[PDB]
């Protein structure tokens, strides 16, 4: 039927779970590295909790089809900061050091402007 | 009335242009340059 | 409100914040981070100053087209100093020097020149005025400079009784003459210390946490007419600041004892410079004058400021001294209070 | 076109051409910068009948 | 023509002035206000009107190809002037 | 048609191999070299004394814009916006409104010379001749601020232009 | 190439970026005197072409 | 109209830089004799569609 | 001939068409649909399944030839459910031909990469991997090309803003450069030019 | 322009000026529209 | 004899040196830079002002941004100028240097270099004429020659 689709790499997300591990276990080795071939002043600690992050906010997915995009540009990120085809700007792109807080509750947004 | 004026090539076209390569010949043949040359040694050591 | 000054965007360079700053003092270490935060929002900043169009050329990006104004300015001149604070909203005070020359001392940067602008800025209708002063002025101090810092500070809270003073502690960071002036010590073989750096205690202050503060007194109608003090969270030794700072640069550490009078005539050795001294005797009063605690003013955190602890940015600072597994050894800090 | 005639020999004799048949400078053989004005032609759907755009 | 303001501040041809309270005019201080002093609106007031003899005249405001589109003014109302739309000159029909 | 340029087979007699061998020993091709160099050093050099001396240029050279005014001193935009719309950089910006006499004038006419693509697209578009790109190329300035010109500025430009752009103009309008 | 330059200015104002050729042919005609001033370019450019 | 024209396209036997520094060389005269063609046939009439 | 309107070539209209049933022919199992342009371009529309076994045989075969991929792109059509149209464009020199071979695709459905076939394609499908996200399976080396080291989205998606999401500056705290969120001095302005009347009644739809 | 002046015209400056770029000058770019919105003016006196 | 004489002969030495001897490391990008390689030719010929053609950026003195920047390109452009030894100057050539020209709204584009780097002198055009160029870097030697940095320092 329509949901009878072509996969990726994962015929189902057990499958595609198994790599998203592989990744992060990858990932997670690389921050020591990164931090010091980079000369970043973030802690390996701040590194490694960047990665948790990233990889929590896409925890909701049941696609396997969208994990297995996931994982495959995650690699290429990996291999993009492994390479040094990064320069330290792009490492540093994730943490928005120069990006203020903006405000989260009502009352503060209410006072700033006009958006939700 | 005015006739039609513009850019166009001279009557009877323009002169011809060359484009073919042109390299010329100079200088002597292989057997006169050593001449010389050898020529030049004795007279030198002379 | 004016039509023109209401907040509009979301807070991004092309934005408008509503401010407009004339921050005299801008192309030194503290200005510079004042016009970037205040160009960040799309703040208007006018920037008098005094020296060559080409030393002011790093500020020129820090805002979006027609955000940054340059003025010539004289410090003895009130009608340029009018010219450049009659459009503002708020004025901030960033001027001094850390050494006095023929045309201009202690008193002449830190009383007359703070006194012209406040008077000036109150006469001009400006609201608000943001003056910086020192954590350990007093004039009881031995330092010349600490001393024409409680001198003008009096001054300004006469002339305009609404300022804001900010009375931050010694300020470190990429171009701070303080772990710097640390770190080039080394430059010579000794490293001489009051006593053995002992009987000093610094509690110095991260340079955007004074940023952040700054910018958040210009916003807060609560700090009109107060006194802050900016310190860091941890107070330190001398003898343990200077060693951590070695030890972060890599350097190797060689303490020896001296007292004030074997350290003033190296101080005023290098006063004979034409140019920024190494250091004066002046500098090494301030350096070894114990850090005022002063529980009866706000301080960052009313600001809504957290302090940075200086760990977490002394390699920030120090990686450019150098030579070429991060143990670092944190230093030791004096319990709290 | 202003080298002497020595001037004009020798660096013949050296690139082995008559360089002065050829100058690589411009003199006044190039065409004047005022000229009478133009009067140019209309194409052939400038016309007052058989003319419908339909058919074209 | 080039008024000022009480501020002393020129007022342009649009009208535009910065007013008293309005810091952007921290702009022009050690430079100046660019303002273009021959005001359109008064130079073709200064213009005459053209007297003609027909009910219908037509303007291209003058050099050919160089000037308009071609306009057709009608000129039957007697309590005012024709004007041309694109130029701004004005016609006036004589007797009639 | 078609030719070979490199399918050439050597003679291999001796008059031939030995003139090659002297080209080799005795460097006579790069000889050559050294003298077509040489001849060059002798020629007069093609360079002008700028900025006494400058590069020539035509009529429809596409350089700094300017608007322009009929002979009677009234502006020639009459705020169709076609300009505005062809833009291929959306560098120009139009306001407009009734004048006092009622005139149809534009209130606002800026262009972003930092926008802009010096295309000419704007002066083909406008139905009256009122925007142009002049003969100016020489207006480099020390701010990205004084590259944004507004209407005061783009008048002040025909006014001060207007002498050369309407020769200009006059030498190639029969071309338009 | 810098006399070349010339003829792209000459037919549309512009040295380089001419936008010149249009869908429906181009933009403006040659101005009278650019065929003249073209083959005199012509005539000496494979002598150029040699000394390269 | 380059059915109209005539030139000869220049072809490298080594598939090399050479040739290919050859082939380009040779078709700069190759242009040269197309100018040549079109300064000689350019005929009169109108530079754009007469489709308004 | 009418002097602006473009002249018809029916000889060449006749022979793509008989080619082009001739490729239906022989690979029923793929080829979806063949057509012929007014200005004579055959295009050959095909199920994604016969990438490799339609391009191999236009290459291979000796009535066909096609040796040169001339490009190789994509067309984002939102409307569609398979909204990516993957458009391959070959070229033949023993013929003097050109045909175009069209496919689809969505946004999870890989397509097989086509380097085994042209070498060609390494690039170009690294190209629309990048601008369009479409995933290329077995590909020797997929990564982006033209957009910056981990920039976000596909830039040429219909739906993906024509500024972007961020923008660059350098910030003198940080002593950096950095990204942030885009803000516009002058907002890009939006031309609604379509007339509302029909152009081409050739080309209308059934209501 | 000795032997073809150029047209005469009353607008046109009769002192050419120079590249005006770095001095008191320059160019300085500004909106030559009007406000927009008016906003509402309370009234001078109180309500009672 | 006044300190203020003899500060004033040096400045203008000083200044006479650096803006005749002008170094300027070409960042060719684009299509800017094809005419900047015009100012170089023989008809322009930059060399004949003491503006060497092809410097090494370590013994530049102008950075000449001749082109579109892109953000991929961004920080290597930011490099290259962090690198330049003092006094250093930057000249943005170009519609697309000088504010995104006609890429303004692209996502990749950074509109105008004056984001990255500080900027002396701005050269309008797409592309400007060599000529045009050219009058920029004269427009830049005046502004070198105004410099007052030992007037100045003598009234510190
Ligand atoms: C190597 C040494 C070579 C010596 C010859 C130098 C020389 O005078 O050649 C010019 C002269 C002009 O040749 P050209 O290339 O045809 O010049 C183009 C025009 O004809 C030239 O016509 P023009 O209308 O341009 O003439 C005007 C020009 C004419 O000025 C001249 O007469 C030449 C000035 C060079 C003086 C030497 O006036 C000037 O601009 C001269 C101003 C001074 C310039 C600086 C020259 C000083 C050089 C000596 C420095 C020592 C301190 O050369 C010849 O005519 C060929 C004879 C060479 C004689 C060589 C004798 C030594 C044997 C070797
Ligand atoms: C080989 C190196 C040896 C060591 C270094 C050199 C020796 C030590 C320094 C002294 C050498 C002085 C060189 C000559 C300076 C004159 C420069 C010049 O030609 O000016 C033309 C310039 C030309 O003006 P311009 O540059 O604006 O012209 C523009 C270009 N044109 C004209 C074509 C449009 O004239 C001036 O404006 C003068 C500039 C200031 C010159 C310096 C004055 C002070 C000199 C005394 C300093 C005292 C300390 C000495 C130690
Ligand atoms: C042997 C061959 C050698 C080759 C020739 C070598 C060059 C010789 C000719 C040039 C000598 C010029 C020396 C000055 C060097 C340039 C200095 C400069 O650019 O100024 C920047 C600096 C500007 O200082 P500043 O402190 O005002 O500005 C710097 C601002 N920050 C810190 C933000 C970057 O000038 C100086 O520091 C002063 C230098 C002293 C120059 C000597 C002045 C003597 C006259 C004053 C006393 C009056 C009584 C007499
Ligand atoms: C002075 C003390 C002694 C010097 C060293 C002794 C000689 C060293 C050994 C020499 C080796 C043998 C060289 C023989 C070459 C003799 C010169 C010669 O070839 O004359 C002819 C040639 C120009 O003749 P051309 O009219 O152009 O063409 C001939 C007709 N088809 O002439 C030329 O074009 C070339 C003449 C210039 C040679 C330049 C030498 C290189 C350095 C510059
Ligand atoms: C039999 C072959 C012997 C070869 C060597 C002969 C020799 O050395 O030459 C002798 C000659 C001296 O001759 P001399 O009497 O001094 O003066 C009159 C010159 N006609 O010496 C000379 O003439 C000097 C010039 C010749 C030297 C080089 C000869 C060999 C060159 C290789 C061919
Ligand atoms: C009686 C018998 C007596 C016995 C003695 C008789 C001896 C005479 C016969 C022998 C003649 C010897 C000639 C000496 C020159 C050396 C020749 C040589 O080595 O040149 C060949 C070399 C390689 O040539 P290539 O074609 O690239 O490859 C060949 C190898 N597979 O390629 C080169 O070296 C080319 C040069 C490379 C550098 C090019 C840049 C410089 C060119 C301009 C130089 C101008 C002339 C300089 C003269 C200065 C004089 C002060
Ligand atoms: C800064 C500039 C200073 C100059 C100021 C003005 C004066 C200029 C004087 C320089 C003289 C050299 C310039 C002219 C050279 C050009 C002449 C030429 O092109 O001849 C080419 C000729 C033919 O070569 P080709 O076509 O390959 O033929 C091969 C088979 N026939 O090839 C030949 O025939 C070459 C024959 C000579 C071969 C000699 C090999 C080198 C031997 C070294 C001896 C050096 C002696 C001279 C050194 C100086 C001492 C006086
Ligand atoms: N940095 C620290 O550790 C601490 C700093 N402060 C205070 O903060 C303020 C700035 O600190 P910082 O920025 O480090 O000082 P800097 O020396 O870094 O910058 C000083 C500023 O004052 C200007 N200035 C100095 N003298 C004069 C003068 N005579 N006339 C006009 N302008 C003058 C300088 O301009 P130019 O570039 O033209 O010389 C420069 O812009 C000072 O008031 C300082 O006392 C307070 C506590 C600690
Ligand atoms: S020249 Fe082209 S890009 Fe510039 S304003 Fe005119 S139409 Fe727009
Ligand atoms: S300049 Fe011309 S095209 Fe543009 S709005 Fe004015 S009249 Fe219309
Ligand atoms: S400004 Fe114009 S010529 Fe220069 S790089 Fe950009 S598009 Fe090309
Ligand atoms: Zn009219």
Redesign the pocket.
Known sequence: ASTSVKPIFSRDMNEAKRRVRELYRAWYREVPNTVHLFQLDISVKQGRDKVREMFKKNAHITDPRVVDLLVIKGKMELEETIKVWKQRTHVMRFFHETEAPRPKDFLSKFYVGHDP | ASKVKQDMPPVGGYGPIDYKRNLPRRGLSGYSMFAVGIGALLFGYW | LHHAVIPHGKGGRSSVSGIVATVFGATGFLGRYVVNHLGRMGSQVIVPHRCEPYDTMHLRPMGDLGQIIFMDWNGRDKDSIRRAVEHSSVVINLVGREWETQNFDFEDVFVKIPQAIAQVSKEAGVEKFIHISHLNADIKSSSKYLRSKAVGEKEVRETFPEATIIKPAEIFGREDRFLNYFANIRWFGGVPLISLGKKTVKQPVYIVDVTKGIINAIKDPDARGKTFAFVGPSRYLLFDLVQYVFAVAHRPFLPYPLPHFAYRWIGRLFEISPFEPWTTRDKVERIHTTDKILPHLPGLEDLGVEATPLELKAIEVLRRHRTYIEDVQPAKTIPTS | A???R???WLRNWASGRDLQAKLQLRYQEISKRTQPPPKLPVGPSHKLSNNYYCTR | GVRTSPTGEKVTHTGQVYDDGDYRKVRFVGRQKEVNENFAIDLIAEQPVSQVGSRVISCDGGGGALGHPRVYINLDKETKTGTCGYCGLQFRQQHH | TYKYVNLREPSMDMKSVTDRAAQTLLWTELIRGLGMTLSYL?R?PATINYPFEKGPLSPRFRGEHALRRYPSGEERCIACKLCEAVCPAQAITIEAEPRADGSRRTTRYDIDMTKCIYCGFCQEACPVDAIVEGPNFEFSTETHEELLYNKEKLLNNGDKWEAEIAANIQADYLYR | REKMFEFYERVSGARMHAAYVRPGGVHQDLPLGLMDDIYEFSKNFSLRIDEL | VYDQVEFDVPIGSRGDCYDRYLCRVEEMRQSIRIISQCLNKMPPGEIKVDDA | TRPTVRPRNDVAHKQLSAFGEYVAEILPKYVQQVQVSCFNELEICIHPDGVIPVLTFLRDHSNAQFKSLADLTAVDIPTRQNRFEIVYNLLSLRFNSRIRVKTYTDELTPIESSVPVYKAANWYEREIWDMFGVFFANHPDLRRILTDYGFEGHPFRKDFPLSGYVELRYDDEVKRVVAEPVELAQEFRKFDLNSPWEAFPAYRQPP | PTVKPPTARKFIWTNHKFNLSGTPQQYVPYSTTRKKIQEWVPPSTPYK | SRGEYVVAKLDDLINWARRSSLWPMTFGLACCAVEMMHMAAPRYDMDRFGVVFRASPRQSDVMIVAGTLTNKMAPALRKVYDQMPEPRYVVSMGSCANGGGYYHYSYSVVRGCDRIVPVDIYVPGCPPTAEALLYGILQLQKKIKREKRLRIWYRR
């Open positions: 202003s080298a002497t020595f001037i004009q | 002798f007069e």
